[PDB]
Amino acid sequence: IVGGYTCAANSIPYQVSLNSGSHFCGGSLINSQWVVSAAHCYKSRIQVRLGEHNIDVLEGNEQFINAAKIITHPNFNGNTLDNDIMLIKLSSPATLXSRVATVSLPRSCAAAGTECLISGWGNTKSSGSSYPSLLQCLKAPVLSDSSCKSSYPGQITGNMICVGFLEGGKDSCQGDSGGPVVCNGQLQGIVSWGYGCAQKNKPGVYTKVCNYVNWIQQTIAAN
């Protein structure tokens, strides 16, 4: 997260980390047994970490649980990153408490201008590189379709939304992929891609979660 601030402990209890050696992507806990992340974070072996604040120090609150099911969206396209969403079913259910809670799915799509909270342990620099121990947070608005489309000619599908600032300076970055974008207490986006990080006129692009509530529910009900 570039241009953000260190989140307060217990402020983002639904944030998880996906590991396959080290932390590669973020994710969100949607129920005691399921996590949602980006399909491009797919790996055949994944360990999910919950209740984390400082990723470099065991604090006694963490739960390390292996993924049992790893399901990417049927229409995920790796070249365009369309339908960049993935569901992970935990091998054992997470224990819900102060540092571990679920985030709610959205009833409908967010309106442009909605303020949202983005979080993750990715790079905090747009030109150099610096990865923090503590989870970073950033408040940013949902952008209108015209602005997003004007920023990325011929690259925005109907399953993508831009969240950020046209002025650059604040944005998600490498290591933040799969992370949550929460607006009014509902998960509206998943960190996906962008042209660098925090570049002027190049806001971050996120998976539009409101388009996937049915697929999510059906997948969870059938598994």
């Binding site: 080290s22 932390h23 590669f24 992507c25 980006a38 491009h40 974070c41 990153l81 960049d84 990715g122 790079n123 590189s129 990865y131 990325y152 690259q155 998600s172 970055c173 490498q174 290591g175 933040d176 992929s177 799969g178 960190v191 996906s192 891609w193 962008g194 042209y195 660098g196 990080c197 570049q199 971050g204």
Partner: protein
């Protein structure tokens, strides 16, 4: 230098002896992935 890339951290070593955040950021700099993982 800067290109449209997914925001995943999956380090890769470059032919120029440099490790990039991911392969997209490597290719974006016309560098070849000498290896998968940070340059040792």
């Amino acid at each position: 230098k800067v290109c449209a890339c997914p925001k995943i951290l999956k380090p890769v070593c470059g032919s120029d002896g440099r490790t990039y955040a991911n392969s997209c950021i490597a290719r974006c700099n016309g560098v070849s992935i000498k290896s998968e993982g940070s340059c040792p």
